[PDB]
A paper describes a structure:
Dissociation of ATP synthase dimers into monomers results in the loss of native cristae architecture and impairs mitochondrial function. Here, we report cryo-EM structures of the intact ATP synthase dimer from Trypanosoma brucei in ten different rotational states.
The trypanosomal peripheral stalk displays a markedly different architecture compared to its yeast and mammalian counterparts. By contrast, T. brucei lacks the canonical bH2 and instead, helices 5-7 of divergent subunit-d and the C-terminal helix of extended subunit-8 bind to a C-terminal extension of OSCP at the apical part of the peripheral stalk. The interaction between OSCP and subunit-d and -8 is stabilized by soluble ATPTB3 and ATPTB4. The peripheral stalk is rooted to the membrane subcomplex by a transmembrane helix of subunit-8, wrapped on the matrix side by helices 8-11 of subunit-d. Apart from the canonical contacts at the top of F1, the peripheral stalk is attached to the F1 via an euglenozoa-specific C-terminal extension of OSCP, which contains a disordered linker and a terminal helix hairpin extending between the F1-bound p18 and subunits -d and -8 of the peripheral stalk. Lack of bH2 in T. brucei also affects composition of the peripheral stalk in which the divergent subunit-d and subunit-8 binds directly to a C-terminal extension of OSCP, indicating a remodeled peripheral stalk architecture.
Numbering used by the authors:
A (entry chain d): 17 to 250, 290 to 325
B (entry chain c): 71 to 114
C (entry chain h): 21 to 157
D (entry chain M): 208 to 255
E (entry chain g): 2 to 269
């Protein structure tokens, strides 16, 4: 720092009045713009064939499974499954795949009904870690705001050492300006508008999934009806080997299908 | 025996229904890039 | 003799530093010494008129180079001869704002710390603090 | 009377990578903070 | 009857009031003075900030207003300006480098940046040919963040200049700034890529020379004057009045700016 500097470095505060609300509004507009560009275009509107709330569908699934639980026999993972277990998995998978998109993260049921392949396990771990990190960050930033400390991050620096280290003041003063401006701004986004935009984006897919779930339930009900009817009363080379798949084989087939879809998606971009 | 073949056909339909299902993980723009854009907009 | 010749060549731009670092006032003061200007001016008198004028002009430009680019852009808009007074007034205004923001004793401590970091003489720091206090009221 | 000094030699400014406190706000913004540190080091090396 | 358009971009109210007083006192009311945010002709822009609708940011060293320290110097500093969007929206100079990192498509932005750089390079080569220099100096900030905008800037500016037949020498920001402030006679034409540091360098050079008026070339085609301090704004207004076809008034304003920088309005 050799050489008498001409000016003393006071904090760069010149915008004495910069309301946090305006900064958060700008950070929300920028985020919305970037999200819109990344996603692309709003998907075309989809009209549900049958209007049934997700709550009613969940109630119907629970009622059907509770009624049919009589035939629920536990078996090893590497064992052929029963019609009842197959129906339970096929329905709960759709239900929880919908709930995960809708935003109700329940990492107990999601980890049991939606995770079948190791890639799914990794994705679930990342999702859970990210959600917990976001929650902790939000709580810590609210507590920091209550205390009054600067909203933005502050590096662990000792500028009296940096001044001595560098020979010329210009880079050091520039660094101080940058970090003071960073610590004098709130890198906070209004999650209500962001969530609203995301919801508007994922509306066609959710409605399609709900219609598919309703159709699946209506198609499974007749099978249980036939099974109960038979219970109350009591070329072929293709139909001899047919058997319900073991859970492990289901995992492997799901892995194959997911890898195929990933390969197709990767090939689409080029 | 037609009952047996019909039963195998129904089980085949259920098996096909199960196999076609696959969990679909979506990818969303990482917020670090949004923070970087916000920082740049500040002229930092 | 070698030192003056090297300084003259460096200011004239014929010879640059080892790493092609910018020829600023700070680097020259670091290498040649605190009073390089005086010795260079004394040495230039033993040279023809053109070299004397070039030396004077280069010394003036290097002295202008003592501010960061941002400070020159903000304060040197209305000429270099008026740069020093404008920069001093801006710094005094910043000091007044800091005083009105966070008291006086903290301001005294902060000015002392910056003077320690900014390589300022105690007399200059005392004059600056007295001037800002007087400007406040 | 031998060599005295190479006046045209300047000790390069030894940069230091800024270190951020280890909190959740740092893990969430790890990439952005690393980018800021890299930019700071580049500025220190080149000059501005 | 006539109109001068005043654009305000980050200028303190004192400077704008001084400009308005100067124009009112010198013109005498024959030409009106309206305020706006964008223009293509007969426009003076006040303040460091870059207005909306300008693609090139040329600045020279006028002979009349040469400071005694910088007597005889002749170097043209042209800053390339990309199109400016609203303050809230993400600017092109940052989008072109952040979207690539985020993976978003960057085709339209690349096209717009290419058009802007082609126009700026054409202006720079025209200036170089007029002055007679053989080589131009490109200025790019060497930070890792700006690893895409500067790459495109080089790829296009060097392409256009070589197509015109001149040579280009690329350099960073600190070295060129120091050379321009200390030894500016060794640079004939220096182009600057669009970054905040380059804007600050352009302002520093325009001020250190003694206070000058920067010319902006807009998309519509034309030249609008620019100033940031009292003397610079006075010189910009003088040039604008000259363009409108007023010689004696322009000379009076220029003389007043030369004599009394900070209080030209009272001086004249």
């Amino acid at each position: 720092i050799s050489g008498v500097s001409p000016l003393l470095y006071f904090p760069p505060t010149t915008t004495s009045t910069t309301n946090r609300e305006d900064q958060i509004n700008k950070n929300t507009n920028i985020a919305i713009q970037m999200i819109k560009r990344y996603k692309g275009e709003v998907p075309p509107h989809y009209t549900r064939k049958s209007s049934a709330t997700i709550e009613q569908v969940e109630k119907e699934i629970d009622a059907l499974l509770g009624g049919a639980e009589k035939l629920r026999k536990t078996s090893t993972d590497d064992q052929p499954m029963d019609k009842l277990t197959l129906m339970e998995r096929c329905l709960r998978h759709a239900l929880w795949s919908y709930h995960k998109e809708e935003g109700r993260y329940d990492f107990d049921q999601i980890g049991r009904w939606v995770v079948y392949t190791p890639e799914d396990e990794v994705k679930l771990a990342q999702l859970k870690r990210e959600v917990e990190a976001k929650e902790k960050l939000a709580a810590l930033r609210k507590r920091r705001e209550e205390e009054g400390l600067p909203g933005g991050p502050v590096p662990r620096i000792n500028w009296p050492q940096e001044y001595s280290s560098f020979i010329d003041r210009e880079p050091v003063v520039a660094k101080r300006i940058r970090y003071d401006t960073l610590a004098s701004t709130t890198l906070e986004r209004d999650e209500k508008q962001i969530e609203s935009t995301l919801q508007q984006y994922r509306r066609a897919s959710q409605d399609k999934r709900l219609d598919d779930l309703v159709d699946l339930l209506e198609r499974f009900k007749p099978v249980l009806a036939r099974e109960a009817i038979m219970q109350r009363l009591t070329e072929e080379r293709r139909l001899l080997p047919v058997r319900l798949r073991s859970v492990n084989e289901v995992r492997e087939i799901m892995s194959k299908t997911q890898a195929k879809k990933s390969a197709e998606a990767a090939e689409r971009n080029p | 025996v037609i009952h047996f073949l019909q039963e195998k056909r129904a089980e085949q339909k259920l098996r096909r229904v199960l196999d076609e299902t696959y969990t679909e993980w979506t990818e969303e723009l990482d917020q670090a890039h949004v923070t970087d854009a916000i920082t740049r907009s500040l002229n930092i | 003799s070698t030192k003056m010749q090297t300084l003259h060549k460096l200011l004239t731009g014929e010879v640059s530093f080892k790493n092609k670092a910018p020829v600023k006032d700070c680097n020259i003061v670091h290498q040649f010494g605190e009073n390089w200007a005086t010795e260079l001016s004394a040495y230039a008198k033993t040279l023809p008129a053109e070299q004397q004028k070039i030396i004077v002009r280069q010394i003036a430009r290097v002295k202008l180079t003592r501010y960061t680019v941002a400070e020159l852009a903000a304060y040197c808009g209305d000429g270099p001869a008026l740069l020093d007074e404008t920069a001093r007034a801006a710094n005094i205004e910043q000091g007044v704002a800091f005083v009105k923001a966070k008291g006086v004793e903290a301001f005294e401590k902060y000015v002392a710390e910056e003077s320690t970091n900014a390589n300022w003489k105690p007399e200059e720091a005392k004059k600056f603090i007295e001037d800002v206090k007087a400007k406040a009221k | 009377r031998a060599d005295e000094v190479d006046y045209t030699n300047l000790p390069a400014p030894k940069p230091q990578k800024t270190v951020w406190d280890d909190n959740i706000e740092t893990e969430v913004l790890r990439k952005y903070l690393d980018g800021l540190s890299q930019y700071d080091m580049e500025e220190a090396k080149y000059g501005v | 009857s006539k109109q001068l358009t005043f654009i305000s971009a980050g200028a303190t109210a004192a400077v704008l009031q001084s400009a308005s007083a100067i124009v009112s006192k010198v013109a005498g009311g024959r030409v009106q003075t309206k305020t706006a945010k964008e223009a293509g002709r007969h426009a003076v822009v006040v303040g460091p900030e870059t207005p909306i609708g300008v693609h090139t940011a040329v600045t020279e060293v006028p002979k009349s207003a040469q400071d005694p320290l910088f007597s005889g110097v002749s170097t043209v500093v042209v800053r390339a300006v990309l199109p400016r969007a609203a303050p809230d929206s993400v600017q092109l100079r940052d989008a072109l480098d952040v979207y690539a990192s985020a993976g978003i498509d960057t085709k339209e932005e690349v096209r717009s940046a290419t058009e802007a750089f082609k126009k700026s390079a054409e202006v720079a080569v025209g200036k170089a040919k007029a002055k007679g220099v053989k080589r131009i100096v490109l200025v790019v900030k060497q930070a890792s963040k700006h690893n895409c905008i500067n790459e495109l800037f080089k790829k296009i500016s060097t392409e256009t200049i070589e197509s015109a037949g001149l040579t280009t020498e690329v350099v960073g920001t600190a070295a060129v700034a120091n050379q321009l402030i200390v030894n500016p006679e060794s640079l004939g034409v220096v182009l600057l890529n669009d970054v905040a540091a380059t804007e600050q360098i352009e302002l520093a050079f325009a001020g250190v020379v003694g206070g000058v008026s920067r010319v902006y070339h807009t998309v519509e085609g034309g030249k609008i004057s620019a100033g940031h301090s009292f003397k610079s704004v006075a010189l910009a207004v003088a040039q604008e009045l000259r363009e409108l076809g007023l010689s004696s008034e322009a000379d009076k304003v220029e003389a007043a700016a030369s004599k009394n920088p900070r209080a030209v309005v009272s001086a004249l």
